Symmetry: C2
Subunit: 144 residues, 2 copies
């Protein structure tokens, strides 16, 4: 009895779309004025890439909380670096994710490496979604 999930995006004029999520939150998308938009909200691709970053970020946070070392984590960010063709169909050719951490004291690197590998290789939180003509790459960076 597989779950059927539904969402809807409504055009609200010009190039703007509004979604009310199942989680009951607003999402707006817009584009540049040059292509008919009002630059009043993020671009659709921006939401795609942001969502992908969120999928893996949530994994890592959850896992490190679980592994009881998140209390040492002062900062965490994800950076995505991509290449994508210009001619239609525009496809991702490279996707690289940086997981960048600031810990208080020596970082729990074995735990961090495990959380990231879990997200990337077991959960496949990015690769299970995003088509890319190379394997998604990632790295782990510690900042002081």
């Amino acid at each position: 009895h597989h779950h059927h999930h539904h969402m809807q995006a409504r055009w609200i004029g010009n190039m703007m779309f509004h979604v009310r999520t199942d989680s009951n939150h607003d999402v707006l998308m817009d584009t540049k004025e040059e292509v008919g938009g009002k630059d009043a909200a993020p671009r659709p691709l921006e939401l795609v890439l942001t969502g992908l970053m969120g999928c893996t970020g949530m994994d890592v946070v959850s896992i490190l909380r679980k592994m009881k070392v998140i209390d040492q984590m002062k900062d965490f960010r994800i950076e995505i670096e991509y290449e994508r063709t210009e001619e239609h169909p525009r496809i991702f050719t490279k996707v690289h994710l940086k997981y960048i951490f600031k810990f208080d004291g020596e970082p729990p690197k074995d735990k961090v490496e495990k959380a990231v590998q879990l997200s990337q290789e077991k959960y496949c939180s990015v690769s299970a979604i995003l088509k890319c003509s190379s394997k998604v790459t990632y790295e782990i960076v510690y900042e002081n």
Copy 2:
């Protein structure tokens, strides 16, 4: 940085992005998994973005073709199935392009617009992995 974005964890299960376009995006989860339910889920943003990708194609092309002044309403509905066990994968994805036009809908042009977005630009299928081909349909309402 060209073709580069970043998401910052700001506590609990919440992340903030400042887009290249200079807008805010927030993501969060349910309280049961450590979030504050104060923003959409990451996956909701993925699928929102995908619907917007094709939605803006459709709107741009209909405007180009000079029939958008006839269009009272336009929405995209996505229906999807995804497995539950890791690795979670999309198994079925169907998009409805749902239009309300004054008078007789410009059906040839709408089909062309949707076909271009789905089949030429591959605005969804270029991006989203699914175990079955992404399907779609056009619906007219009154």
